[PDB]
Structure 1
Amino acid sequence: MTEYKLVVVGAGGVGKSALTIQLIQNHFVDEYDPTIEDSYRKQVVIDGETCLLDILDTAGQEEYSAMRDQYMRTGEGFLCVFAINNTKSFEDIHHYREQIKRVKDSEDVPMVLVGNKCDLPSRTVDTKQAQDLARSYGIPFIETSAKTRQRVEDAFYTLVREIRQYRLKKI
């Protein structure tokens, strides 16, 4: 059984919790329910490999979190989430990426860019704008909807695949 420690980062309100809960529980949390920062473990088969995913869904970024500091230090791959109807959250992506590189003191960290809420007609971030940002970082870009269950597994499984390739190349 292969472990992958994943960290979901990005601005408040973009759907990090909704994406993680959809993946873990196949449920969509009610729109107005309290979010909480928490970690989740789930055994899953990914490309025929039996995997243990250890996922931290981050929150409360303006106060100390011992768990978040541990997962940022030790996390193996990062899902950088913005919402496609929220330009500020997309324009925040470079700060989240910079935080990750600083903690890892590395320019080469497994990451996937995720544009969530692709079920909303009020899009303000064009798919091609985000694809270009991801291309400039050298990482995959995936558009998701936690609500209509579009590409949720693809987003997380793609990050696992990025970690697997990182490991294979370094050896």
Structure 2
Amino acid sequence: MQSIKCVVVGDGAVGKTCLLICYTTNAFPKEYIPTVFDNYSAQSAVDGRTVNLNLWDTAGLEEYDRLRTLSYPQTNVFVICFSIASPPSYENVRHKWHPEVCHHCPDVPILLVGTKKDLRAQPDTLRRLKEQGQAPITPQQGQALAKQIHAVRYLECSALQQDGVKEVFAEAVRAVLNPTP
């Protein structure tokens, strides 16, 4: 048994806790989860190797940043969840999320997760974002984030469809088990 502190970071209303509750507890949170932060534990396998995950559901608020930055130490992989429905969450990942996780953990591997890849094609999300003057995060856009901020991989998840959830966290683990070059 080998544990990885995978502090899942990411904005509010973008899908950290949705991805986690779909992962650790296997449920899609109906409403925006009021998050301070949590501790979970599951049993997952990574490319044929089973691993232990002691996980952290940190807050996306600007308020309890001191507590979330207390969570960043001991972290071995940073899961940054930003809404594809809200690419301003992608911009926040570019400005604060990745920079703060790196200021608290330099060179500690970071997974990049595009939450709600199922909405890149859903009419409501596209129409809302076009009315907001932005487009849902294309895999090239998240991949540009990943190359720019040295994310080990840019994944996408849809907690509504349970898409990529276990895949997201196995990749988070193998960001550490197999360090990316």
Q: TM-score range by the shorter chain?
A: 0.7 to 0.9
Alpha-carbon offset, residue 36 of structure 1: 5.2
Instruction: Identify the residue that residue 136 of structure 1 maps to in structure 2.
Output: 148
Pairwise CA RMSD of aligned residues? 2.1
Alpha-carbon offset, residue 54 of structure 1: 0.9
1:152 to 165, 168, 171: 165
| TM-score, scaled to structure 2 | 0.81
Where does structure 2 lack aligned partners over 5 or more consecutive residues? Answer: 127-134
Instruction: Identify the residue that residue 25 of structure 2 maps to in structure 1.
Output: 25
- Which residue type is aligned with residue 64 of structure 2? E
| TM-score, scaled to structure 1 | 0.86
Alpha-carbon offset, residue 35 of structure 1: 4.6
Matches within 5 A, 1:1-171: 1-31=1-31, 34-35=34-35, 37-59=37-59, 60-63=61-64, 66=67, 68-94=68-94, 95-104=96-105, 106=106, 108-120=107-119, 121=122, 122-123=125-126, 124=135, 125-139=137-151, 140-166=153-179
Secondary structure in 1 aligned to 2:24?
A: helix
Secondary structure in 2 aligned to 1:73?
A: coil
Where does structure 1 lack aligned partners over 5 or more consecutive residues? Answer: none
CA change 1:33–1:134 in 2 (3 A) is closer
- Which residue type is aligned with residue 143 of structure 2? Q
Alpha-carbon offset, residue 64 of structure 1: 5.9
Deviating above 6 A after TM superposition, structure 1's stretches of 4 or more consecutive aligned residues are: none
CA change 1:76–1:129 in 2 (3 A) is same
Whether the 8 Å contact between 2:44 and 2:170 is mirrored in structure 1 is no
CA change 1:117–1:74 in 2 (3 A) is same
Alpha-carbon offset, residue 65 of structure 1: 5.8
Alpha-carbon offset, residue 30 of structure 1: 2.0
Instruction: Identify the residue that residue 131 of structure 2 maps to in structure 1.
Output: none
Secondary structure in 2 aligned to 1:119?
A: helix
Aligned length: 165
Secondary structure in 2 aligned to 1:44?
A: strand
Secondary structure in 1 aligned to 2:167?
A: helix
- Which residue type is aligned with residue 41 of structure 1? S
CA change 1:88–1:43 in 2 (3 A) is same
